[model samples]
Target chain A: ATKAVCVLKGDGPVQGIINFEQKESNGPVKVWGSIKGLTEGLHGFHVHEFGDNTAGCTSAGPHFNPLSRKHGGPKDEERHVGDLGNVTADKDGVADVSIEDSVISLSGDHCITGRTLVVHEKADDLGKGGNEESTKTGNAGSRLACGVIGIAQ
Target chain B: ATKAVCVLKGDGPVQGIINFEQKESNGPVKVWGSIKGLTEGLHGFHVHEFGDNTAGCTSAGPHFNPLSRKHGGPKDEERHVGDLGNVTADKDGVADVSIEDSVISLSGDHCITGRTLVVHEKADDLGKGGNEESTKTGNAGSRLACGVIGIAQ
Candidate 1:
């Protein structure tokens, strides 16, 4: 049986919900969400390793980079599995991003079912040309926002 | 009726948020946040209680303090109802923090409704011996950055 997890997207008055389901490929998890009243720009998104309702949302640790990789673009060879990719907000600072990855699994003992989802503070460089080398993923600046990835309601 | 709440704040690549409602006098709800890529300085902050949508901000819950009081300072054993104390970023680059207080609450019955504010790199110092007894909330440092209290859209 396949299980699903839903992490509510929150950032104060602007609240949204993200639903994740284990795909048939058993590779990347499926995600769909919507945000309102954003500043309009690029936002960084990722999966954390913990499920903490306390400490506010900061309790969740760094990206689910189990492989211990540097921060960089999503296409980089060496990056954290939690570093799914970057979400681009339209001219209105809103984004509807949907992408899948093979590195992200659902059942393995290394499953991220208990992990958390987080939004960055700024746009990701997308591993473009910058101080953040390929060794790292798109050097998304700060954690503009975040949420937890947990079992769906 | 289920509702999600969260906060919006971070350095460059991280955004903190949360969503939770006040159950009773003992909701036992915890509210906190984080900030990465710190430049090695003190970050002054607090938990207001409301979301600053018009102001482009969304912190989580209100102050966790249960005792209806005034902003007595972080270190003040008798601080305000919205005082979350303070958070510091060590040279290591990560500001790991945890706050546990039975006197804190996120209920709407209190005075905090706007959300917390991280006043940049400074200290609160409470009211101890001229910034000595309370090194935390000493002098309202510079306004390096700011984030609102609310939930993700």
Candidate 2:
């Protein structure tokens, strides 16, 4: 199979290329990239449920929780499949991402090659938040940028 | 010495106590706290130039860059002294913050006791953003919540 790439875009000047690579057919996938335009800090990084960015990054749907589980941290046992957690950006407005995730598959029936990747304005609480939405959306706030996951060689 | 605690209050439900503690005569100040009511994401957190929040968090003034450094990430050498960077929140709308900064002092003449703590609605670009405000404000969007830094018992 091929690696998946997502070219993020938004109304703002935020732009970047995210790559998803899985060495094994069913092992953890390595996601990496350098996202620019973010203010210095952590942002919610996730694979949304849809690839239809027709409206905007906010229209990418919610996190790709196909498994029907509560929202939680990346390491939580019962969390969304698309929850990649937070990406820390430097003062230079760049996030050098290097995440190894096991749920996002590149092959088989659960492939996420055509989903959407979203970068939020705030950090993902991993479900340990102060509101009722903690177990649902992580309340990660606005969508700053997003892109559809596409297959690449 | 005494730790300056800011009881952050804003129009929204964002509430928390940010404690600033300096262990030595002139060393890094430890800023720690648990802020609740934020959406799920990273919110721009910094000490503003003024303690006057009369008009709201927007009136908190620009970042407390006492040294007049450019807006930058927390780890950047040329960053604002008040640049504590982004605080990642949980899915429940709370941010568990723990930051140790070298420039911010508690006993120095340039103490931030009378300044303001502002929590923004977006990520702080750390000056590496696409707009001109990047170097000055990091383009961190609107002010969600804020408070005045005061001396605590």
Candidate 3:
């Protein structure tokens, strides 16, 4: 009874499907996704604060950092709740990966429902780049694709 | 198969459902809606340029005035395409109305497929109030509810 889905949208070759699954209450949310039409390298990927896609991907606001913590990787305890690190694309310009996220959930304070998932143009440095932008967003470049997370029955 | 929908959201006691339908090609788009939790009077309602709801209704940007025309009623030939006039609520705080907008379409330059619908706290002055606000937004107060217009199956 626990499921979520998102359909990425962008002007470039950015299109993909993201799915979330939860097996039980207070359990880790399983995230699996595949994206195409990206550069062959690591790209910043995170859940934005808003699901607004009116002005392309920029309308989704900043990262979903409810605790006001500094930017970091998905495994960093001080990272934003949305910090999922990066998605690595292959020579075919496709990224396919699956992982379990303990900080995100379908319900409760870390609920990501109705939020946004954005794919960036460049790699995410996980707040250790020795720059000011690292503390804010890891200096992720322009948003390449964006999608709204919706409950799936 | 030409249809659209909007889900309103705001801080006040405002909630509603709006539906748009395209009955024919090159014909006026039919708009039908029913809203609750409104004041017992008229409220300004219009489609915005962007469907992004990241910053609530404010991020939707100005009215869909692609023609760069002055603010006017929905019936005005030189009015903004997003101008749908007003929605009058009864004493029970409910507004149910249906309209056929000639300037709005599901396709072409007047297409409102990926736009937004916004409800205001005050009535739109329809540019007849003889002030700068009237010409700009008809002096419509803060946005009460905002929703994105998504294509309906």
Candidate 4:
């Protein structure tokens, strides 16, 4: 399996991914990683725009909301398409989150090539499924740590 | 050197960063990189609050506004601690920006660890600093893309 480092800037604790997969138009990518040196709490995660690593890491943009919808979970119907839901850290602040995304595509015009993964400071309600913007997945309040996911070139 | 990624989950193009630093105290962090594949022209860039990647990188909180100042630029006196500046993309949708942050800390309680970087759809004045709280960073406009700066393990 190809491996790459997940470098969070000064804004976060050190994190490592054990596994990540992005098959063609086949299915959802499988990702496994551990946030070892965290402070124990709930965190947010979603795909973002841009792939530039210049200004240290502040150059990365917001969630990949192609549909202009509000922020919702990956499963939400009216969410911002970029939503990936919330993740939790254990008592030791070590979070091990794993899930499959139908919105996340490896190829096609809606690709995540130089995009990113951002952690927030709150929880994502995952849209109750019966809301105006069920896709707006509960607001993933506050920008936390972030990670960029690129092809294993 | 480590690498991260960001994906445009929307219809329009987005921009952001791949930040890096040595983690220091009371000093400046070196910053550099490129901004390309822009769906639009020009955008804003800046450092943010929190850095907790737990919860999928959402553990990080609002912009690094310890001072609660209004949004502006690095040269402005009344800007939020998170506002960096602007990044203009050419017609070809490409911009290569490189800079160093002299005010941001990397180690102390006010570090950028686990923090994510972000890009917007609008352009920053870089003069008045965009004015007002402007959604943290001078209303740098819509969020195009974003990436978190994980620390080096």
Fraction of true contacts retained by every candidate, in order, equals 0.00, 0.00, 0.00, 0.06
Backbone clashes per model, in order? 75, 19, 1, 78
Q: Which stretches of candidate 3 lie above 4 Å from their native place? A: A1-153
lDDT of 1 at A119: 72
| Global local distance difference test of model 3 | 0.81
Candidate of highest lDDT = 3
Query: lDDT per residue, candidate 2, A14-81, as tens digits?
Result: 77888778888967899998899998999998888755544566556778877899898888899998
- Score residue B52 of candidate 2 by CA lDDT: 50
TM-score of predicted model 4?
A: 0.45
Model 3 DockQ, alpha carbons vs. true complex:
0.03
Residue pairs of candidate 3 with colliding backbone atoms: A54-B52
Best by DockQ: 4
- Summarize candidate 3's per-residue lDDT along A43-128 as a digit string, tens digits: 99999876665566776788998899999999999999999999999999999968898998876645776577898999999999
Off by over 4 Å in 1: A1-3, A9-14, A127-129, A132-138, B1-153
Encode model 2's per-residue lDDT on B25-81: one tens digit a residue.
687888999999998998888887765543567656788876877889888998888
lDDT (CA) per prediction: 0.51, 0.77, 0.81, 0.56
Q: Which scores greater on TM-score, model 1 or model 2?
A: 2
On DockQ, who's better, 1 or 3? 3
**What lDDT does candidate 2 reach at residue A64?**
82
DockQ for all models: 0.02, 0.01, 0.03, 0.05
Among incorrect, acceptable, medium and high, the docking class of model 4 is: incorrect
Q: How well does candidate 4 score on lDDT at residue B26? A: 63
Docking class for candidate 2:
incorrect
- A129 in model 2: Cα distance from truth in Å? 0.3
TM-score (chain B only), all candidates = 0.57, 0.94, 0.96, 0.72
